[PDB]
Amino acid sequence: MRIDKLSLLNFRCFKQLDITFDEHITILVAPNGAGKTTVLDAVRLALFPFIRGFDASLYVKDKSLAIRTEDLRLIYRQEALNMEMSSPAKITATGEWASGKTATWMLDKRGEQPPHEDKMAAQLTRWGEQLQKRVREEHSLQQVELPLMLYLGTARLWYQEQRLDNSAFSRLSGYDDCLSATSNYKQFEQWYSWLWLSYREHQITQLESPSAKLKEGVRVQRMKEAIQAIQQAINCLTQQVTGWHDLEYSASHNQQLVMSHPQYGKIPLSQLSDGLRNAVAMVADIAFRCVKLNPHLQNDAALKTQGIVLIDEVDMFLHPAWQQQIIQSLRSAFPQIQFIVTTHSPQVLSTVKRESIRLLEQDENGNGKALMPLGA
Amino acid sequence: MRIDKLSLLNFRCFKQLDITFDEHITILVAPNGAGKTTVLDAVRLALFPFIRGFDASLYVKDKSLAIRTEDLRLIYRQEALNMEMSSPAKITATGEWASGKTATWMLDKRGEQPPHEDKMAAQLTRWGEQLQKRVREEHSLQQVELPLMLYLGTARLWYQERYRLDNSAFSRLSGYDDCLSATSNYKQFEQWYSWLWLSYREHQITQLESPSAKLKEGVRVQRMKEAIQAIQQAINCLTQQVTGWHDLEYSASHNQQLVMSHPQYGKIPLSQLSDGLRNAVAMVADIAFRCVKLNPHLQNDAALKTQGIVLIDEVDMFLHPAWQQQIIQSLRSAFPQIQFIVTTHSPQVLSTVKRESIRLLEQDENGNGKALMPL
Amino acid sequence: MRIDKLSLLNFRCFKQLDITFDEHITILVAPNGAGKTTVLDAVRLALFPFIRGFDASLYVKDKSLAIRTEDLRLIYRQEALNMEMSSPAKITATGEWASGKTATWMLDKRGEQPPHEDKMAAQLTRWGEQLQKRVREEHSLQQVELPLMLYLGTARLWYQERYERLDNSAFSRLSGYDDCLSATSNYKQFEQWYSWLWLSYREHQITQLESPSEGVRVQRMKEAIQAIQQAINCLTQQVTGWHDLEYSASHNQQLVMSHPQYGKIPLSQLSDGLRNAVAMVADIAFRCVKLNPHLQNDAALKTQGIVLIDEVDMFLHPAWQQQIIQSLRSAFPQIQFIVTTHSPQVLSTVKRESIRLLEQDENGNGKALMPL
Amino acid sequence: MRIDKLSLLNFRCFKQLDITFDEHITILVAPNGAGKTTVLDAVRLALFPFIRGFDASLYVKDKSLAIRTEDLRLIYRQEALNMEMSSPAKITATGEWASGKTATWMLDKRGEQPPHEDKMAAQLTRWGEQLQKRVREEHSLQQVELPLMLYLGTARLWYQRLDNSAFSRLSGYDDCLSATSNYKQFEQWYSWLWLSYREHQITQLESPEGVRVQRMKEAIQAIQQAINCLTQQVTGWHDLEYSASHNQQLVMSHPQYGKIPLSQLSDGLRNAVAMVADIAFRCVKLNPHLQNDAALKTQGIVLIDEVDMFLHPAWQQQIIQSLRSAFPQIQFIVTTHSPQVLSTVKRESIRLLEQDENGNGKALMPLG
Amino acid sequence: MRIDKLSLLNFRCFKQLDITFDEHITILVAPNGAGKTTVLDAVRLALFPFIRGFDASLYVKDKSLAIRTEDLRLIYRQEALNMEMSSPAKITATGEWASGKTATWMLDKRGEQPPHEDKMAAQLTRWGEQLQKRVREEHSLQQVELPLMLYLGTARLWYQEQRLDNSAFSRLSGYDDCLSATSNYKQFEQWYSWLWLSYREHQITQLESPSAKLKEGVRVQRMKEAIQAIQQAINCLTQQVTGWHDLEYSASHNQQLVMSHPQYGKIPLSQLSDGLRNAVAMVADIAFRCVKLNPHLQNDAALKTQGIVLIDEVDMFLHPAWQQQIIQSLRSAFPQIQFIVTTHSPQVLSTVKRESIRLLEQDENGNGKALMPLGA
Ligand SMILES: Nc1ncnc2c1ncn2[C@@H]1O[C@H](COP(=O)(O)OP(=O)(O)OP(=O)(O)O)[C@@H](O)[C@H]1O
Ligand SMILES: Nc1ncnc2c1ncn2[C@@H]1O[C@H](COP(=O)(O)OP(=O)(O)OP(=O)(O)O)[C@@H](O)[C@H]1O
Ligand SMILES: Nc1ncnc2c1ncn2[C@@H]1O[C@H](COP(=O)(O)OP(=O)(O)OP(=O)(O)O)[C@@H](O)[C@H]1O
């Protein structure tokens, strides 16, 4: 979808806040205190209505996706013995789903009562259910494109039957743990290893019975093109600056992924630099979701998929020459996704214009301002 | 807040009952199987709607706070050797909420259908919600006075061998936690009192270290000291004269326990004391700390300037007659602005009590009840 | 068994105390802070070894059955504003176990060292082991008579909404010693045993009615039910009106009582006094029935032992208070009672030879004396 | 203890490298793939034998404690399309172990054969065994000064008594090469220690034996001094405390703004405080026979990877000086890739890493 | 070891029992009741002192290898309301170990008290500890022969790293769950598959690269002889009556165990008859323990290992022609193992002498007698 602005009232550290988001790229910088995680959590809480209408609900018991009592402001006064909650907590998300309509959905919590949603949240989850039911039917000539809602946190490296063909499954499995705060690298390695081995098996079998090629070769073709897509995205980060390219799988290396370099050969990914692993994990996380969601594009799963992706500390483990080429490379790899990223490195801030910078300042009473730089 | 009259219809052992309360103290005197706990439960059920408007009532797990099928009167027909269930069971209560506002509200239950209430109970709930909103408001000029509601039944007893803070324990509304429930609330008092004492000692040590911070920093020390003295005075007023023990405090030497002092004896933990003193201290503390927590802007008159209704069942238990002759006066002197409704079956409590506070309960063969002043 | 004299040295509030008990009933009358629960705890600690000789004492989770450092006397030195712990704490008990056998046994604790006991304390454990061995024998011509020991403290109370498939050990005689000298409530055991009895009796009733003519077990069950019912009637009927305690399936499988004017009501819907009195009497009655099954009709009327009751007049109005001692003596004629109270109404019709006023001096010297 | 030179032959990425360390501080400044973690890992492996003689490393099964097959260099041919697995992996470390006790030790790995070392490594291991036996004596007037060895990597951010006993002394070397330092455990044990100290203070205050009191008091003093060295310069905050009055929280003091909670600070500063506090606590535990200058008078080697992790550029100009001043006897080896760290450091401690087209690495200093 | 007598007092259903065991084979027959399981459990409880001296028992902590309170005798009388518990319960076992050391140990329980043991039980545990410490050495030239204690129950078909070389491990791992009542066929198939794959890989790297023929032949010979011993033990039951023989591992059938028949070929084991599967499981369960315990024999791991084995319902799922050949084939497969087996069928009873049959009968009071038949 898309988001235009977000308003916060009586949240964790903000008494009130109004923030505006850019069309393509926006960067949040806060010199002191928290506040970046607060805004990212607010945006993450404003999109759970969509994913809830996709069989993802309290079965996993992910209690972090609803406003909690610990998320309400609690003021301490030195001259009094009591400590009173400030009620109610309110998130007002303004967005745009399909070109033409502007929506404004609100999520509020009052004290210890269960959280409450407005009519627009119900409308949004009904839209999610509508897309699910439209996908699940196969007796249609016109296919549909799903949006991508992904959240990447600072815990994305802590603890580092597969299918691809069009169906109700393998098109809704890309929403599994999309907004979770844990790592999801094992899933990528399993899926990629399965895809590579099955592609090798299919290309071996192709030489046996060419008669059914009209029904078989296309399979291989699909299982080829997808790979290319993924690889292309990864290259856009790892080749011009570092030199590594063409992520591959080979059982000859004790069945683990490898990467290629012009001069240092083919080396396992498990014993490379930290920044390369970070970039590979991020771009892989975006890409394999993009290719599972829209197998029907088969070459523009990364160049036509639309959605919203959240990143915390995008410049983690990278050197300045790399930090001067991360934003443009992310834009080139995925040109149709809106990004909300949080940084603090002065190098990254010099690769973007003044319209994509938001300085968050907080007063003593909690009032917050999301300003833009004065000079240019 | 005040309650003035009460009516019961087909509630337990009473086919019909009308009872009138006094402004300050009312004592119900009757033998076993007369209906005192019945009246106390009726008052609890009448007053619950006010508490239902607060966020502290969402954790109540007491099943006795709604009218039940076991509460419907059963009539024994001897010829058929049968018991017939009479319906409906109804409660009516007249009272005053704010200045110059009289009201009457009703509760009912028929058969096995869920209980029902009229509009006035909903208005109590809305009044409670309004007060809760007023308390939680920042930058308020006028002050807010919260009332006190408590029920001290037979589950308050401290028998042999019967016995960090959450962010909600520091709120005013925490004075309404388990207020009208049939449970024991000594652990909450213990935790809060220990926290006050630890904070006060921390400030004392800090002041003793550097004598250069006694400017705008000593307000919190003063507030805590005043809360401590209020609770201590309230507890002393019941025990000191007849028993000698006073000054309930917190001691780290005695394995971090609550201790009390005697002139002839020494200083002993509360859990090692007599049953009567132990129960009396628990009973008085249950009111004192709630009074301190609810209204923090009085700061030394929380016990002496709080209004509300407090219910006590079997007030003279574990106390010898010499102690029984002083309890009503001690409670009236400690908490002078609280309407007390108490029940007893001992002539010693009524030793020095006016005849305008005693209600004898009588019943006829058909179940018609009477609550009358003594002649 | 029987206890005749007791001595306390450096216990909680007594530097020294010597107390003599009566054969049948003895009442301790004193205000608060006088040492009645102190004497009851002393007697409980003295009597523990006999139970410690039984296999039913392995599941005891009570920390109050051993002398603790909190029981050592503390002397307040005013000049130094100090508390001094005086040692040692001793408990001496004189009594009789079997015919023509007088004994005296002592318990001690010094400092923070573990408590100690003498040889005469171990002989009680050995006698308990011997009795247990004689109860678990097949083809024994001689009968075995077991004594009853019970403690009914302040933890027995049935307050508002307390609401406290049998194991194979619940059918043994020795199960009469489960949590006997512990500060706990034992109402669930009585409820389960009584419900099982009533269900079995009804099963036999329908079985007999189906095919008119096995005949002995029905008689045993009927006799046990009659004994328990009579024991409760001896206290509840005359003053209040509720007599028969029965199991009812029509009332959602609950225990019910009946009244001449009112109807039939569950026990958990009655007054506090009724609940407490019924629990107190039943706790003795069903243990009497279980311990000695060979009497079969006089288990309550022919059982010997010691029963300790604290605050016997709780939740009872003066008219009921005037008759508790007589009711207990009429229900259980052969049991030695030691009870504590501070009400002048319980002593209304009691001989002066059963009253022990407790007093103490400024130095802690205690006296338990007859009135006048 | 001190390391003076490291030499590597046929390592992960270096065909031959010779680096000279400094007495106090050294920074390896290089972009990605230039071999900064490799140097730290080599130093870490060189120090394994000393720890190995403590009967505590046999429980954990970690493959990184010895050279593996993945360590051996691989050469690319570009014509045969094959990777040549070179051999042997060589590690040479020279230094001082005591007052005028110089030594030079070596670790080797040939092919798939298990790694083996010279008997000077056994000499170091038996020196460690001698130390652990000597400290275990229950009656000895002589004072033993144990050193500090710690490795804080990029995995550090994710998951009882202070008596003069052998268990307390040997608890310092627990997980000394796989240390973790986040905020949760730090606040937990700091709060426990402060609660015990406040209990003893209140006991003394109420009624006017001291063995366990002074230890806690001066451990508090040491930790407070270290954190103050970290924070009191740039900001006025100092004297981290646990306040039960202030909603039972860890609070800091500022002469103008009063008291502020520690939960209002950013994650980076909290993690830096936790790192400094953990190092100071290990220093206090290891050498109790000073009780207040343990952090200021203990020698050893501490290895930190990516010291500029999650730090605002304003706090990247004071980390090195703060670490130097809070521990003026420890030898530090840290790896950075940010110029803001180097804005106040002298030239002598900077070791830029270069590598030719073959793998002939160099560790040099800026020319000026 | 060996057992020559067993006495039971106040156990589950026997008030008093005295039973004598034969040197090689003994059969227990009971027309009614559950005495056979009682006697087998008594024998199983009298051998746990030996196994308790091995640390490998730490893997199992079931509360079933000690005398429970439910194992005592409860007396129900129809004329009384009380039900009492007969105490004490005693298991007296008379046996021989060390080939000449006669002993008589006793286990007892008194009511709810914890179980008690005599000096001889401690001696047996100490002898187990001595054997463990003597095995844990490696440089010693003289080799130790361990005994086997195995129990097979009726639940041995329900539930349906690796090393072999001489060491402290792989010689004590054969005692893992030796007296448990849960099936352990998975832990046999895993070990057998590992052994077969390793042997095949050694053979492949042998003939493919003759230069690596220096000293790897000894491992190949040891593994070959282990396979041969297991196969012969299984053949001694299967071949003569059913025709199947020479079980094999082959990945050509989806990595599954296979068996061979001259007139039907090679078939996966999971699809044969029930009786053949039962026999394979039993003989495998004996065999791989016999070969892991004593690799040093390396030719007669089955023909020279001594011990005691208990079988419940030995004739399960077998037809009458197979029930006249089970006892003799068990004896031939393992000639030096004492067997205590329980059965019903009259066909098995005709293949053994009159001196190896025990008939258990109970009186009304519980007194038990173990008679011998008069006829043939
Ligand atoms: N559902 C019912 N229908 C009719 N009578 C009932 C019912 N439930 C209880 N009763 C009777 O009503 C009386 C209840 O009296 P209650 O115990 O409340 O008063 P009390 O004697 O003053 O006791 P307390 O000490 O608890 O105040 C008892 O006689 C009881 O048997
Ligand atoms: N360890 C101790 N040292 C000194 N004095 C103690 C100690 N423990 C308790 N005391 C005091 O001695 C008193 C003993 O009286 P106790 O409460 O046992 O009897 P009682 O007043 O008759 O109570 P009850 O209602 O239980 O019969 C305690 O109330 C307390 O004041
Ligand atoms: N086994 C190996 N054989 C050959 N080259 C290797 C091997 N393992 C790693 N490398 C190469 O060595 C380099 C790894 O450098 P290193 O791991 O020291 O990282 P770094 O750039 O110093 O940063 P960081 O501290 O973040 O890890 C990469 O160029 C990698 O391709």
Resolution to one decimal, Å: 2.9
Q: How far apart are CA D60 and CA C310, in angstroms?
A: 60
Q: How far apart are CA E36 and CA E154, in angstroms?
A: 12
Contact (Cβ atoms closer than 8 angstroms) between residue E368 and residue E361: yes
How many Å lie between the centroid of ligand 2 and the Cα of residue B281? 15
Beta strands of A76-204 (E only): which ranges? Answer: 89-95, 103-109, 116-117, 148-152
Phi-psi region of B256 (alpha: psi -120 to 50; beta: other; left: phi over 0): left
Among C161, C286, C273, smallest CA distance to C227 is for C286
- From chain E residues 84-113, the ones with a CB under 8 A of any chain C CB are 84-87, 111-113
Q: 3-state SS of chain B? A: CEEEEEEEEEECCEEEEEEECCCCEEEEECCCCCCHHHHHHHHHHHHHHHHCCCHHHCCCCCHHHCCCHHHECEEEECCCCEEEECCCEEEEEEEECCCCCEEEEEEEECCCCCCEECHHHHHHHHHHHHHHHHHCCCCCCCCCCCCEEEEECHHHCCCCCCCCCCHHHHCHHHHHCCCCCCCCCHHHHHHHHHHHHHHHHHHHHHHHHCCCCCCCCCHHHHHHHHHHHHHHHHHHHHHHHHHCCEEEEEECCCCCEEEEECCCCCEEEHHHCCHHHHHHHHHHHHHHHHHHHHCCCCCCCCCCCCCEEEEEECCCCCCCHHHHCCHHHHHHHHCCCEEEEEEECCCCCCCCCCHHHEEEEEECCCCEEEEECCC
Strands D238-243 and D249-254, sheet pairing: antiparallel
The two structure tokens encoding residue C331: 């229900």
Among D165, D96, D150, smallest CA distance to D127 is for D96
Q: How far apart are CA C240 and CA C260, in angstroms?
A: 10
The two structure tokens encoding residue E170: 């792989």
What string of DSSP letters covers C300-343? Answer: TTS--EEEEEESTTTT--HHHHTTHHHHHHHH-TTEEEEEEE--
Residues in chain D whose C lies over 2.5 Å from the next residue's N (breaks after): 159, 208
**Which residues of chain C neighbour E9 with C-beta distances below 8 Å?**
none
Q: Does D160 touch chain A (CB under 8 A)?
A: no
CA-to-CA dists, residue E262 to C240, E244, E266, E270, E274, angstroms: 94, 8, 9, 19, 20
To the nearest 10 degrees (0 to 180), the angle between helices D183-206 and D211-231 is: 130
The two structure tokens encoding residue E344: 């019903």
- B79 burial level (CB within 10 Å; 0-12, 13-18, 19+): exposed
Q: Does A376 touch chain B (CB under 8 A)?
A: no
- Experimental technique: cryo-EM
The two structure tokens encoding residue D164: 């003069």
Give residues with Cβ within 8 angstroms of D367, minimum separation 6.
Answer: none
List the strands of the sheet with E16-20, edge to edge. Answer: E16-20, E2-9, E89-97, E101-109, E116-117
Q: How far apart are CA B96 and CA B98, in angstroms?
A: 6
Rg of chain B taking only CA atoms, in angstroms: 22
Contact (Cβ atoms closer than 8 angstroms) between residue A96 and residue A113: no
Which residue type does E146 have?
Answer: L
**In this complex, do B204 and D203 lie within 8 Å of one another by their Cβ atoms?**
no
Q: 3-state SS of E75-144? A: ECCCCCCCCEEECCEEEEEEEEECCCEEEEEEEEECCCCCCEECHHHHHHHHHHHHHHHHHCCCCCCCCC
Contact (Cβ atoms closer than 8 angstroms) between residue A315 and residue A349: no
Q: How far apart are CA A326 and CA A237, in angstroms?
A: 7
Atom 27, ligand 1: residue with shortest CA distance: B37
Q: How far apart are CA B34 and CA B343, in angstroms?
A: 11
Q: How far apart are CA A117 and CA A130, in angstroms?
A: 19
**Which residues of chain C neighbour E86 with C-beta distances below 8 Å?**
136, 138
Which residue type does B107 have?
Answer: L
Helices (H) and strands (E) in chain D, counts: 8, 16
How many Å lie between the centroid of ligand 3 and the Cα of residue D29? 15
Question: What are the contacts of D233-242 at 24+ separation with CB within 8 A?
Answer: D233/D318, D233/D322, D234/D314, D234/D315, D234/D318, D240/D190, D240/D273, D241/D194, D242/D190, D242/D191, D242/D194, D242/D195, D242/D198
Strands D362-364 and E256-261, sheet pairing: unpaired
Which residue type does E49 have?
Answer: P
Smallest CA–CA distance, residue B55 to chain D, in Å, is: 22
Give residues with Cβ within 8 angstroms of C171, minimum separation 6.
Answer: E81, E82, E83
Which residue type does E275 have?
Answer: G
**In this complex, do B138 and A80 lie within 8 Å of one another by their Cβ atoms?**
no
Q: How far apart are CA B17 and CA B362, in angstroms?
A: 10
Among E247, E236, E224, smallest CA distance to E298 is for E224
Nearest chain B Cα to C318, which residue? B346
Q: How far apart are CA B25 and CA B355, in angstroms?
A: 11
B201, B202, B251 ranked by CB distance to D243: nearest: B202
How many Å lie between the centroid of ligand 1 and the Cα of residue C261? 14
Instruction: Give the residue carrying structure tokens 């000695």.
Output: C292
Helix, strand or coil for residue C50?
Answer: helix
Can chain C be said to touch chain E, i.e. do they have 3 or more Cβ pairs within 8 angstroms? yes
How many Å lie between the centroid of ligand 3 and the Cα of residue E131? 51
Is the peptide bond preceding residue C260 cis, with omega within 30 degrees of 0?
A: no
End-to-end CA distance of chain A: 31
Q: How far apart are CA C6 and CA C90, in angstroms?
A: 11
Q: In the beta sheet, which residues pair with residue E9?
A: E16, E90
Q: Does D209 touch chain B (CB under 8 A)?
A: no
Q: For residue A349, what is the enclosing H or E element? A: helix A346-349
Contact (Cβ atoms closer than 8 angstroms) between residue A247 and residue A234: yes
**In this complex, do C33 and B76 lie within 8 Å of one another by their Cβ atoms?**
no
Which residue type does E3 have?
Answer: I
Which residue type does B80 have?
Answer: A
Phi, psi (5° rounding) for residue E329?
-70, -35
For an interface test with C, the pick among E82, E110, E113, E365 (most C C-beta atoms closer than 10 Å) comes out as: E82
Among C39, C45, C51, smallest CA distance to C63 is for C45
B273 in contact with ligand 2, CB cutoff 6 A: yes
Question: What are the contacts of A55-59 at 24+ separation with CB within 8 A?
Answer: A55/A132, A55/A172, A56/A175, A56/A176
DSSP designation for C365: B
End-to-end CA distance of chain D: 31
Among A278, A281, A283, A290, smallest CA distance to A315 is for A278
How many Å lie between the centroid of ligand 1 and the Cα of residue C5? 43
Contact (Cβ atoms closer than 8 angstroms) between residue B103 and residue B97: yes
Give residues with Cβ within 8 angstroms of E62, minimum separation 6.
Answer: E180
DSSP designation for D263: G
Q: Distance of alpha carbon C2 from its chain centroid, rounded?
A: 14
Is the peptide bond preceding residue D208 cis, with omega within 30 degrees of 0?
A: no
Q: How far apart are CA A299 and CA E360, in angstroms?
A: 80
DSSP designation for E360: E
DSSP designation for C129: H
For residue D98, the tally of other CB atoms under 10 A from its CB is 9
Beta strands of chain A (E only): which ranges? Answer: 3-9, 16-20, 25-29, 89-95, 103-109, 116-117, 148-152, 245-250, 256-261, 265-268, 307-312, 337-342, 357-362, 368-371
Q: How far apart are CA A342 and CA A330, in angstroms?
A: 14
Q: 3-state SS of D102-169? A: EEEEEEEECCCCCCEECHHHHHHHHHHHHHHHHHCCCCCCCCCCCCEEEEECCCCCCCCCCCCCHHHH
- A22 burial level (CB within 10 Å; 0-12, 13-18, 19+): middle
- From chain B residues 323-362, the ones with a CB under 8 A of any chain C CB are 323, 345-347
B199, B204, B256 ranked by CB distance to D244: nearest: B199
Q: How far apart are CA D328 and CA E121, in angstroms?
A: 64
Phi, psi (5° rounding) for residue B254?
-85, 50
Nearest chain B Cα to D204, which residue? B253
Helices (H) and strands (E) in chain E, counts: 8, 16
Beta strands of A231-356 (E only): which ranges? Answer: 245-250, 256-261, 265-268, 307-312, 337-342
Phi, psi (5° rounding) for residue A90?
-145, 125
Contact (Cβ atoms closer than 8 angstroms) between residue B172 and residue B293: yes
To the nearest 10 degrees (0 to 180), the angle between helices B275-294 and B186-209 is: 70
Pocket test for ligand 1, best of B38, B69, B343 (most atoms within 8 A of CB): B38
For residue B288, the tally of other CB atoms under 10 A from its CB is 27
Give residues with Cβ within 8 angstroms of B2, minimum separation 6.
Answer: B23, B95, B96, B309, B339
Cα dihedral A6, A9, A11, A17 sign: positive
- A223 burial level (CB within 10 Å; 0-12, 13-18, 19+): buried
Phi, psi (5° rounding) for residue C149?
-130, 130
Give residues with Cβ within 8 angstroms of A124, minimum separation 6.
Answer: A49, A50, A97, A103, A105
Contact (Cβ atoms closer than 8 angstroms) between residue B319 and residue C32: yes
Q: How far apart are CA A145 and CA A161, in angstroms?
A: 24
- C93 burial level (CB within 10 Å; 0-12, 13-18, 19+): buried
Q: How far apart are CA E262 and CA E245, in angstroms?
A: 9
Instruction: Give the residue carrying structure tokens 């097979």.
Output: E152
**In this complex, do B296 and A111 lie within 8 Å of one another by their Cβ atoms?**
no
The two structure tokens encoding residue A288: 């394999």
Q: How far apart are CA E191 and CA E197, in angstroms?
A: 10
CA-to-CA dists, residue E231 to A99, A280, C56, E171, E234, angstroms: 74, 52, 57, 20, 5
Contact (Cβ atoms closer than 8 angstroms) between residue A5 and residue A20: yes
**In this complex, do C293 and E82 lie within 8 Å of one another by their Cβ atoms?**
yes
For residue A115, the tally of other CB atoms under 10 A from its CB is 16
Phi, psi (5° rounding) for residue B121?
-60, -40
To the nearest 10 degrees (0 to 180), the angle between helices B186-209 and D183-206 is: 80
Nearest chain B Cα to A72, which residue? B167
Instruction: Give the residue carrying structure tokens 């730490």.
Output: E58
Residues composing chain E: 376
Q: Does B206 touch chain D (CB under 8 A)?
A: no
Pocket of ligand 1 (CB under 6 A): B 12-13, 30, 32-38, 70, 73-74, 343; C 265, 269-272
B170, B195, B253 ranked by CB distance to D207: nearest: B253
Q: How far apart are CA B225 and CA B218, in angstroms?
A: 11
The two structure tokens encoding residue E328: 């003799």
Beta strands of C249-313 (E only): which ranges? Answer: 254-258, 264-266, 305-310
The two structure tokens encoding residue A370: 């999301």
Q: How far apart are CA D117 and CA E269, in angstroms?
A: 52
Task: Please give the angle made by the CA atoms of A145, A151 and A153, to the nearest 5 degrees.
Answer: 160
Contact (Cβ atoms closer than 8 angstroms) between residue E71 and residue E42: no
Instruction: Give the residue carrying structure tokens 């008494």.
Output: A15
Q: How far apart are CA E27 and CA E14, in angstroms?
A: 19
Instruction: Give the residue carrying structure tokens 């098995």.
Output: E348
D36 in contact with ligand 3, CB cutoff 6 A: yes
Q: How far apart are CA D218 and CA D229, in angstroms?
A: 16
The two structure tokens encoding residue C176: 């009469």
Instruction: Give the residue carrying structure tokens 């203070």.
Output: D201
CA-to-CA dists, residue C205 to B265, C198, C210, C245, E76, angstroms: 65, 10, 9, 19, 21
CA-to-CA dists, residue A341 to C283, D49, D207, E15, angstroms: 73, 45, 59, 81
Helical segments of E243-351, H only: 274-293, 320-323, 326-333
Phi, psi (5° rounding) for residue D143?
-105, 130
Helix, strand or coil for residue C86?
Answer: coil
Helices (H) and strands (E) in chain A, counts: 9, 14
Helix, strand or coil for residue A238?
Answer: helix
Contact (Cβ atoms closer than 8 angstroms) between residue B361 and residue B35: yes
Residues composing chain B: 375
Among C210, C213, C205, C151, smallest CA distance to C183 is for C151
Give residues with Cβ within 8 angstroms of E292, minimum separation 6.
Answer: E164, E170, E171, E173, E174
Closest ligand (CA of B270): 2
Contact (Cβ atoms closer than 8 angstroms) between residue A370 and residue A360: yes
Is the peptide bond preceding residue D88 cis, with omega within 30 degrees of 0?
A: yes
The two structure tokens encoding residue D273: 């405080």
